Amino acid sequence: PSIQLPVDYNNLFNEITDFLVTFKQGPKYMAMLQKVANRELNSVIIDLDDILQYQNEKFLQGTQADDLVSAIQQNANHFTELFCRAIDNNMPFPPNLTRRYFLYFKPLSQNCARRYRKKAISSKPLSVRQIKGDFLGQLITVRGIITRVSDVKPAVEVIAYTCDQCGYEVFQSECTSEECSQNQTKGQLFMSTRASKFSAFQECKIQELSQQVPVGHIPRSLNIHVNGTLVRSLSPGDIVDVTGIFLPLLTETYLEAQFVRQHTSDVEERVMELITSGDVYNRLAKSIAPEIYGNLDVKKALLLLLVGGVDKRVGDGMKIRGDINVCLMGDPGVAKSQLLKAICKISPRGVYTTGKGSSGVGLTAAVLEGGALVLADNGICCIDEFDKMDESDRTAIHEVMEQQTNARTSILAAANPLYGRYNPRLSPLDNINLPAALLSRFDILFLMLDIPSRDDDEKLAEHVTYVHMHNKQPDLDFTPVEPSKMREYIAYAKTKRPVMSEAVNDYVVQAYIRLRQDSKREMDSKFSFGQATPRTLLGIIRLSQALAKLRLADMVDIDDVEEALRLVRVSKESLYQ
C-alpha cells in the first residue's frame, strides 16, 4: 500500500551533486575524484562535517537547503548508492556489477554540531547496550573495545559465468543471455572465478568497557563488519570509536564499519610546589598510607619499588631487569594486607591477588586468556599469603621473577608464618614455606614481628584508634601528597635515567667488598637472612638507580648508595628483636 513521507530524494540528489561540484577544498571532493580519475586512489571518504558546513553555508546565504546529513543519518543504506551514482556520472553490463572502488562516510564531530547549534546524536559515543532497534539502518558512532577479529575471507558480491554457446559474460547453470534464450541450444555455465567480484571482508566484534556496564550485568557485544580498503583497521584489544551503519519476524543485528579511530607545564607547577616543600624522598614515603603504622623504612622500599629501577639491555640479547622485588613477612592480624591494597591502588598497572591462583587460571594462561602476572605487564603485582600457593602457582612465579615474561612485573609479596605464629629462634626459611631459591631473587626482604611490647603497642593503638575516630592520621602536622600527584611524580621520575659516575663506581665496589667480607660472619652465625652475593651488588645498583631517579637526578651520587646500603642493613634488624 502506498504512503507519503516528507523525504524528497530529488532535492537531496541535486544537493549532493551541487555539494560535490561547489564545496571547496578548487572543490575538495572533485580534487579527490580527480585523484581517483588519475588512478591514484581506490576509496572515497565522505565527510559529513563538510556536508553540514555546506548546509550552514547555504543556510547563512539564505538559499534552499534540506537536512541532507539527517537523511543520510536515517537511511544511510540507500544514500551510499546515491553518492556512488553521483560519482559514477561526475568522476573525471550494469555499472554496479563492475565497480571496484569503495565509499564510506565519516561521522559528524560534536564540536561541529555545537558550533552549528545542533545535536549530533548519531555520533555520540554511545555503547552497544544503548543501541535500540530504532537505530537499524542508521549511521551511528559506537565507543567500545574490540575483543575478536577474524582473518581475511573471500566475499563474492557478483558471481561471473562464461558460456560456450555465446561467449557472453553472465553475472549473478544455464546461460541467461539473449542469444541462448533465443536459441534452442544453451551452453552450460561454469564458474569464472578470475572474473567474479571479490570483496575483502573481515569479522570484528566490539564490547562495552567495564565503566559502561550497569550494576552487576555482563558487558554486551555487537558485530562489526569491515569491507573494502577499511580492512585491517581493527585489531583485538583496541579501544576504538567506530562509526558504521547499524543493520539487521525476529532480526539479528550487525554493523558495517565506515570510520575507525583509536583512543608538561600543567604538572610541572605541582612538581615545583613539591620541590618548594622539600623533603621529597621522605614526604612521599610518609604519604604512603598514613593510616598504617610507622614502618617508614619499609614504606621507603615501596617508594623505590613503585619508582622501579632502570632496565639495561646489555647486548647480544642479554638482559638485566629494571624491576624491584620486595617481600612482606609478618604475623597475621597486623592488617599488613592494607599496604598491599594501598600500593596496588596507587600504581596505575597494579594487580592484586590472594593465596593460590584463582581457579588455577590465575597464573599462566588458559584457552589465550592471560593470568594476573600477564595482566600486570609493565606494572606491579601484589600477593597476599604467598606461601600457600601451589607448586604450579609458584613455578610460574619463578619464571616471571627471572625472565619477566610478557609479565614485566614488580612483585610485592605478603605471607603469614608457616606455623601461624613466628619463632625468631628459627631461621626465616624454617618459619616459611618458601625456599632460598625464590627468596634470593628478592631485593628487600623485610620481616614483621608482632612483638608484644607496651611501649610500641601504645603508640600503634593510639595511631589506629585516631584513624577510626578522625578521617586523617593523628600526625596532622604532616600534609600527605595526594595519590594522583604521587602517581604523577613517579611517572615523571620514570622518564629520567640516572647514570653511574666513576666516583660512585669505586664506592659501590668498596662498599660491596666491605659488606661481603663481613657478611661471612653473619651467615656463619646462622642469624641472618642471607649471605652477601652479587644480589647485594646488583641490588644496590638497582636501588641506587631508583633513588637517583627518585631525586630526578641525571647521575647517581654517593648518598643514594649509602641510603641504599642503609635500608638493606635496616632490614636485618627485624631478626634481632
Nearest CA-CA partner of 229 in 366, 100, 380, 403? 100
Binding mask of the shown chain, residues 390 to 419, with x at each position contacting other proteins by CB under 8 A: --------------------------x---
Q: Are strands 197-207 and 138-149 parallel, antiparallel or unpaired?
A: antiparallel
Regarding 7 and contact with other proteins (CB under 8 A), the answer is yes
Write down the least CB distance from residue 434 to other proteins, Å.
Answer: 16
Distances (CA, A) of 548 to 26, 159, 182, 326: 59, 69, 91, 19
Considering only residues 151 through 190, tell me which ones interact with other proteins, judged by CB under 8 A: none
User: Do residues 310 and 542 make contact, with C-beta atoms less than 8 angstroms apart?
Assistant: yes
Count of CB atoms situated within 10 Å of the CB of 384: 19
Asked if 344 touches Zn ion (CB under 5 A), the answer is no
Q: Between 184 and 213, how does the x/- string for binding to Zn ion read (CB under 5 A)?
A: ---x--------------------------
Is 492 among the residues that bind other proteins (CB under 8 A)?
no
CB count, 10 Å around CB of 552?
15
Annotation-wise, does 333 bind a ligand? Answer: yes
User: Distance between CA atoms of 384 and 341, rounded to whole angstroms?
Assistant: 10
Residue span binding other proteins (CB under 8 A) among the ranges 127-135, 152-160, 319-327, 564-572: 127-135
535 is in an annotated binding site: yes
Smallest Cα–Cα separation from 409: which of 439, 355, 373, 440? 373
**Residue 22 φ then ψ, to 5°:** -95, -40
Nearer to other proteins, 464 or 553 (CB): 464
Please name which of 301, 308, 542 lies closest in space to residue 445, comparing C-alpha atoms. Answer: 301
31 is in an annotated binding site: no
Q: Is 94 in the site for other proteins (CB under 8 A)?
A: no
Residue 416 annotated in ligand binding: yes
163 binds Zn ion (CB under 5 A): yes
Q: How many residues does the chain have?
A: 577
CB of 480 to other proteins, least distance (A): 7
497-516 residues in contact with other proteins (CB under 8 A) are: none
DSSP one-letter code for 52: H
Residue 134 touching other proteins (CB under 8 A): yes
Q: Check binding of 354 to other proteins (CB under 8 A).
A: yes
> Exposure string (b/e) for 403-425, b if CB count within 10 Å is 16 or more?
ebeebbbbbbbbbbbbeeebeee
Per CB under 8 A, contacts with other proteins among 205-264 are 210, 213, 216, 218, 248-253
Residues 6+ apart with CB under 8 A from 381: 350, 351, 353, 372, 373, 409, 410, 411, 412
Minimum Å gap between C-beta 236 and other proteins is: 12
Dist CA 505 CA 272 (whole Å): 31
Under a CB-based contact definition with an 8 Å cutoff, are residues 342 and 386 in contact? no
Provide, rounded to whole angstroms, the least separation between the CB of residue 77 and Zn ion: 34
The answer to whether 376 is a known ligand-binding residue is: no
Exposure class string for 87-96: b at 16+ Cβ within 10 A, else e:
beeebeeeee
Q: Which of 14, 17, 53, 77 binds other proteins (CB under 8 A)?
A: 77
Q: Please identify, among the stretches 14-22, 94-102, 398-406, 457-465, the one whose residues bind other proteins according to the rule CB under 8 A.
A: 457-465
- How many residues touch other proteins under the rule CB under 8 A: the total is 82
- Given a contact cutoff of 8 angstroms between Cβ atoms, the answer to whether 412 and 341 are in contact is no
Interacting partner of 317 out of Zn ion, other proteins, none (Cβ under 5 to 8 A depending on kind): none
385 counts as binding other proteins under rule CB under 8 A: yes
**75: contact with other proteins by CB under 8 A:** yes
- Choosing among Zn ion, other proteins, none, which partner's interface includes residue 180 (Cβ < 5 to 8 Å by kind)? Zn ion
Q: Fill in the per-residue mask, 277 to 316: x = in contact with other proteins (CB under 8 A), - = not in contact.
A: ------------xxx-------------------------
Spatial contact of 187 and 161, defined as CB atoms under 8 Å apart: no
Residue 355 near which of Zn ion, other proteins, none (CB within 5-8 Å, type-dependent) = other proteins
| Contacted entry of other proteins, Zn ion, none for residue 469, CB cut-off 5 to 8 Å set by kind | other proteins
Point out which span in 32-40, 315-323, 453-461, 513-521 binds other proteins (CB under 8 A): 453-461
Residue 166: name its binding partner from other proteins, Zn ion, none (Cβ under 5 to 8 Å by kind): Zn ion
Kindly tell me which residue out of 273, 482, 518, 573 binds other proteins, with binding defined by CB under 8 A: 482
Collapsing DSSP to helix, strand or coil, 148 comes out as: strand
**How far is it, in rounded angstroms, from Cα 9 to Cα 174?**
38
Q: How far is CA 546 from CA 184, 295, 439, 528, 564, in A?
A: 90, 20, 21, 25, 9
Annotated binding-site residues read 293, 333, 335-337, 416, 441, 535
**Residues in touch with Zn ion (CB under 5 A):** 163, 165-166, 175, 177, 180, 187
Annotated binding-site residues for ATP read 293, 333, 335-337, 416, 441, 535
